[PDB]
């Protein structure tokens, strides 16, 4: 009962003990990046309602988009062609995914079921391959590990690991108090982070099944999360118009990105290929570019006429795709 306060204070001062210096005092010598200009190379049209999710492919050529009509569309990033248009059963979906092998797609929404769609079939048509029906709340985001496993985060304060062929979940993470809104994997495919609605973040283990580290420091809802290329840091965005960078091994925060002219919230966060640029999608109808090592604005990608809800960077760093609520996609380079 009363031991929790003592343990929390012990953690609090143990974290403070290791703090030597801030990132500002160490980064005040490197040359600034400067100013970055980006233009729209391709504009993609064909949707009717708001666009909620987007995910690039492993070959940096194909991408998939999901809207409120209950329809997934697979495009071609070069020729602006359409390859597949899969209609869904439940019109309310808020996530999508692309298999690392380019053979499967994933979807989910308020219908509380995770749907797996097969692309490379022997008949030329697309049919539902498997449906996962274990959660008791609306799905938030799902990600792939291989062609046989998937990780889902839903609104019942839980996260789940599934097996496609067997059909039933194998591990459940139950360490949160509010509904989880975002999660991100790691390059080594052994750990993954999660951000919930209780103004906190957690790091989990795939095979151990238990939480390892928890992080706090935000004042309100945490919307989107990402992962650093090296695997020792992650970025978080909140409705406080605030981004925060969290290191893995020191168990602390390193830098905070914010400004006095930004009142709205944050919907999406992504990194660059080298870990030098941090792209953020705000609610003031335009995005922002931050330098992850100096906390200085580099440019504004203001080309949308509504809220921005999508963001993604290719595996080679070629271009960045942005969706929005006006049924349009844009590719910046």
């Amino acid at each position: 009962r009363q031991e929790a306060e003592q343990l929390k204070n012990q953690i609090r001062d143990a974290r403070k003990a290791c703090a030597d210096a801030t990132l500002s005092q160490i980064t005040n010598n490197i040359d600034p990046v400067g100013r970055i200009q980006m233009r729209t190379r391709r504009t993609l049209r064909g949707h009717l309602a708001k666009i909620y999710a987007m995910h690039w492919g492993t070959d940096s050529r194909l991408l998939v988009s999901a809207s409120q009509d209950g329809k997934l569309i697979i495009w071609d990033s070069y020729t602006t062609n359409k390859v597949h248009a899969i209609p869904l059963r439940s019109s309310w979906v808020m996530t999508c995914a692309y298999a690392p092998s380019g053979n499967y797609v994933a979807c989910g929404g308020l219908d509380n079921i995770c749907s797996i769609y097969n692309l490379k079939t022997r008949e030329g048509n697309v049919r539902v391959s498997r449906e996962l029906a274990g959660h008791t709340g609306y799905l938030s985001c799902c990600r792939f590990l291989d062609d046989n496993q998937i990780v889902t985060s839903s609104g019942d304060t839980t996260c789940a690991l599934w097996d496609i062929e067997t059909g039933q979940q194998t591990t459940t993470f139950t360490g949160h108090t509010g509904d989880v809104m975002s999660l991100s994997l790691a390059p080594d495919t052994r750990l993954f982070v999660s951000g919930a609605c209780d103004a906190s973040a957690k790091l989990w283990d795939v095979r151990e099944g238990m939480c390892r580290q928890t992080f706090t420091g935000h004042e309100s809802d945490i919307n989107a999360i990402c992962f650093f290329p090296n695997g020792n840091a992650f970025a978080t965005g909140s409705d406080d118009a605030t981004c925060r960078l969290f290191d893995l091994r020191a168990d602390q925060e390193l830098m905070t990105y914010s400004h006095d002219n930004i009142i709205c919230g944050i919907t999406s966060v992504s990194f660059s290929k080298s870990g030098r640029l941090l792209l953020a999608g705000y609610d003031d109808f335009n995005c922002n570019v931050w330098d992850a090592l100096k906390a200085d604005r580099a440019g504004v990608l203001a080309g949308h006429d509504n809220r921005v809800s999508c963001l993604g960077v290719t595996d080679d760093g070629m271009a960045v795709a942005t969706g929005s609520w006006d049924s349009f996609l844009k590719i910046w380079n």
Binding site: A302, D305, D326, F328
Partner: protein, 286 residues
């Protein structure tokens, strides 16, 4: 020829202003994604017709009024091309009025009835009818039998007044005016009823504001178009006072009619919220 030169000067000023404003409106529509609605297609058609009047009709009208000698059909060609664009603008105004009537008096079926395909078809038929109406004189409704005085280029020496009164005025102008008047009276009554419902001294103020805003549209059209067509009827129905009339009284009348091309963007386009938002965004960004 001081009055004649002044007429040409004001015609040139009006043409320049009309082309500037309507090209601005068309460019604003073309480069905005959120402005591609079926309602705005009619506004684009009106702006295009006004551009056509400004760039082509005014020089042709000045050339006709100059008064030099040439052939018959060449001089009729200018008059026909002058007529067609004005008729197209007249029809576009009626199309916009009908669109607003459908938007207000039948709200639940507005989307199922007005779409892009039907708007495009309506515009195509409306522009074809203008060409059909303006090309009637070439079918034989001419004055080559008298051949005027090889013929001096005046409007009255090619196109007869019977065509201007019986066919054009009573057939292609007045019924549109009646339809717009009826539509706007109905819209005003519908607005007044909902104002009464929502209110339950300010209510009368809002009613007066709505009445003024609705009446100005019809007033501008009537003041721009009636004087030109009144003189033709006066000349045809009674020739006594028509034969001895001031020479300038016609010219100003013609000018007034072309003024309708420069007022239309302000009344219809600039007042709308979407156009103001697009203009503000473009000005701020650039």
């Amino acid at each position: 020829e001081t009055q004649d030169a002044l007429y040409v000067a004001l015609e040139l000023v009006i043409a320049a202003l009309s082309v500037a404003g309507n090209v601005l409106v068309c460019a604003a529509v073309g480069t905005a994604n959120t402005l591609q609605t079926p309602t705005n297609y009619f506004l684009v058609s009106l702006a295009a017709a006004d551009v056509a009047v400004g760039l082509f009709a005014i020089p042709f009208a000045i050339t006709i009024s100059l008064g030099f000698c040439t052939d018959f059909y060449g001089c009729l060609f200018l008059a026909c091309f002058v007529l067609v664009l004005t008729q197209s603008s007249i029809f576009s105004l009626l199309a916009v009025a009908v669109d607003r009537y459908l938007a207000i008096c039948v709200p639940l079926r507005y989307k199922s009835l007005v779409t892009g395909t039907r708007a495009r078809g309506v515009i195509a038929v409306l522009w074809v009818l203008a060409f059909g109406i303006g090309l009637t004189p070439f079918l034989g409704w001419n004055s080559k039998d008298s051949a005027t005085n090889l013929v001096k280029c005046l409007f009255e020496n090619v196109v007869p007044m019977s065509y201007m009164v019986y066919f054009n005025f009573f057939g292609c102008v007045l019924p549109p005016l009646l339809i717009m008047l009826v539509i706007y009276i109905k819209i005003f009554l519908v607005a007044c009823r909902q104002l009464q419902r929502t209110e339950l001294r300010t209510t009368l103020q809002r009613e007066i504001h709505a009445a003024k805003s609705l009446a100005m549209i019809v007033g501008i059209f009537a003041l721009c178009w009636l004087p030109v067509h009144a003189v033709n009827c006066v000349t045809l129905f009674q020739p006594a006072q028509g034969k001895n009339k001031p020479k300038w009284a016609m010219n100003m009348a013609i000018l007034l009619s072309h003024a309708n091309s420069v007022v239309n963007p302000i009344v219809y386009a600039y007042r709308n919220r979407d156009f103001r938002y697009t203009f503000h965004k473009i000005i701020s960004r650039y």
